[PDB]
């Protein structure tokens, strides 16, 4: 794979690359579709609207949107002007948003009419920097100030050229949380995007112009982000996008060709997402879908999921590793070989590591801390020197994940070095669980484990010590927390115990927790 010049901006690549196609459809969700010219036209005014209202190059601007054909607009456009967008989880609270734009110091906010009560809590409580308030597909009347996206878009003409930045040059963020502490701000650049569309889009997964791509995976995601913009806009195939929650039956309806007149060819998702579709009774069959290849991410893959997929439409799940901070999948199964219980092989261009406890070898077989080695990776953490230093380290990112390699040069995944937990493919902290129940007055402590389930996916189990003089049912901290967390945070299922295994010091002993 070339490198990308040194002067080049991400959006003027992906639009450059389809004025070959400009009547092929982009992008199609529920209610639109956009032509790779109409998407070009669009992403191009939108550009010149945010620097018409001042948004200067480098700046930030908080781009909070369900999948749908105006957020490429949003995210190209601001890329296309040389501002960066920083895509968030859609799923958040008030709370989260108002310390993101705070952070960020975003200077407007692109949002989804659904989005707007949430977004306007968090401008409310915050010393936020935001100079326009930008509403995709209003649910309510538009307070003074605001503007609809599709005005904003049409009374401005396109901006004539690309912001002339280059390829190490900051593009966009997204944000990932730890254990504690408030989310990271991951630093992208223009590069980035090239290389996992290069490396893992074109090259490892062959993606085509006449394929139709569709992600469960929601475009904020990294996973997603390739998967339904940066891998086929670089290809020129076309997208299939969802505003609502995926769920079996949604996505079936998509696989049938139910919207846009499109059926998809290629599909991606969580393992959860997998085993929630093959225990659908209305699991369509081999001959009414278009799938030819299917591609998952978000938390390990079980071999049973993976081998039930195949007996039943005859397409391997192919299962691989990325993260955050490297943008994209970095080790991976390949679509014509697929090793079940294993993460597959590294993906070229990329270079893996295992290190122990010193920052040593280890011998095949045992496991390591994994380290990546590639080129695109993030710069920094925004604003948080210390986490930086302990992620990024000298042309090597350490990922949180534990692996073994094989001796087939495959290599197993064998949990994480911190305590997160992937639930539902999705990163979720004990810890936050814990917080929450322990405010109900009926609780004294709680302690939050992942336990794999029926399928071996991980789901959080709680261990709740209830107090001594207080009423505390299992129905009524359900109801406590339905309220509270969402949905793929719930325990699957809680424990009422009378004490929690301790330190001499009282901290709990989560792996005695584990180990029954
Ligand atoms: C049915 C289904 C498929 C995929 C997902 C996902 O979160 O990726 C969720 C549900
Ligand atoms: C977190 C992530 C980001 C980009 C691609 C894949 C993943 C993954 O969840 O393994």
Same mark, same amino acid.
């Given at each position: 794979v070339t490198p990308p010049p040194e002067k080049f901006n991400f959006a003027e690549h992906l639009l450059q690359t389809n004025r070959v196609r400009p009547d092929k459809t982009a992008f199609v969700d529920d209610i639109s579709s956009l032509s790779f010219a109409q998407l070009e036209a669009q992403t191009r005014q939108l550009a010149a609207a945010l620097r018409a209202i001042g948004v200067k190059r480098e700046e930030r601007v908080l781009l909070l949107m369900l999948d749908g054909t105006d957020w490429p607009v949003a995210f190209l456009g601001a890329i296309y002007a040389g501002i960066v967008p920083v895509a968030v989880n859609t799923l958040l609270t008030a709370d989260d948003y108002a310390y993101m734009l705070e952070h960020?110091?975003?200077?407007?906010?692109?949002?989804?009419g659904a989005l707007h009560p949430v977004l306007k809590a968090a401008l409310?409580?915050?010393?936020?920097?935001?100079?326009?308030?930008?509403?995709?597909?209003?649910?309510?009347?538009?307070?003074?100030?605001?503007?609809?996206?599709?005005?904003?878009?049409?009374?401005?003409?396109?901006?004539?050229?690309?912001?002339?930045?280059?390829?190490?040059?900051?593009?966009?963020?997204?944000?990932?949380?730890?254990?504690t502490g408030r989310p990271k701000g991951v630093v992208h650049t223009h590069a980035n995007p090239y290389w996992t569309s290069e490396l893992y889009g074109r090259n490892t997964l062959h993606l085509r112009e006449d394929d139709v791509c569709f992600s469960a995976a929601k475009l904020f995601f990294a996973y997603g982000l390739g998967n339904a913009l940066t891998f086929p806009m670089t290809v020129g195939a076309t997208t299939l996008l969802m505003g609502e929650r995926p769920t079996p039956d949604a996505v079936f309806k998509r696989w049938l060709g139910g919207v846009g007149g499109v059926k998809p060819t290629v599909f991606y998702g969580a393992p959860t997402?997998?085993?929630?579709?093959?225990?659908?009774?209305?699991?369509?069959?081999?001959?009414?879908?278009?799938?030819?290849?299917?591609?998952s991410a978000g938390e390990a893959l079980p071999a049973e999921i993976g081998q039930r997929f195949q007996r039943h439409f005859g397409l391997d799940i192919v299962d691989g590793i990325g993260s955050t901070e490297m943008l994209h999948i970095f080790l991976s199964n390949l679509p014509d070989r697929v090793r079940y219980g294993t993460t597959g092989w590294p993906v070229?261009?990329?270079?893996?590591?295992?290190?122990?406890?010193? @920052?040593?070898?280890?011998?095949? @077989?045992?496991?390591?801390?994994?380290?990546?080695?590639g080129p695109s990776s993030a710069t920094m953490y925004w604003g948080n020197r210390a986490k930086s230093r302990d992620t990024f380290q000298?042309?090597?990112?350490?990922?949180?994940?534990?692996?073994?390699?094989?001796?087939?040069?495959?290599?197993?995944?064998?949990?994480?070095?911190?305590?997160?937990?992937?639930?539902?493919?999705?990163?979720?902290?004990?810890?936050?669980?814990?917080?929450?129940?322990?405010?109900?007055p009926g609780?004294?402590?709680?302690?939050?484990?992942?336990?794999?389930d029926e399928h071996g996916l991980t789901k959080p189990k709680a261990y709740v010590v209830p107090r001594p003089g207080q009423t505390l049912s299992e129905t009524e901290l359900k109801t406590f927390i339905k309220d509270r967390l969402a949905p793929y945070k719930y325990p699957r299922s809680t424990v009422f115990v009378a004490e929690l295994p301790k330190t001499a010091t009282g901290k709990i002993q989560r792996f005695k927790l584990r180990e029954g």
């Open positions: 960020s110091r975003a200077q407007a906010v692109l949002v989804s409310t409580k915050s010393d936020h920097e935001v100079q326009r308030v930008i509403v995709s597909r209003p649910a309510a009347p538009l307070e003074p100030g605001e503007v609809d996206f599709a005005e904003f878009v049409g009374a401005h003409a396109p901006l004539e050229k690309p912001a002339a930045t280059q390829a190490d040059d900051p593009a966009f963020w997204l944000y990932s949380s730890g254990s997402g997998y085993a929630g579709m093959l225990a659908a009774p209305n699991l369509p069959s081999r001959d009414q879908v278009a799938l030819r290849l299917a591609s070229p261009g990329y270079q893996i590591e295992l290190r122990g406890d010193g @920052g040593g070898p280890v011998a095949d @077989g045992e496991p390591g801390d994994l380290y990546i080695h000298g042309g090597w990112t350490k990922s949180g994940d534990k692996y073994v390699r094989n001796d087939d040069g495959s290599y197993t995944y064998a949990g994480r070095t911190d305590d997160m937990l992937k639930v539902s493919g999705i990163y979720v902290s004990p810890f936050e669980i814990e917080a929450t129940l322990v405010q109900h609780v004294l402590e709680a302690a939050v484990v992942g336990v794999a």
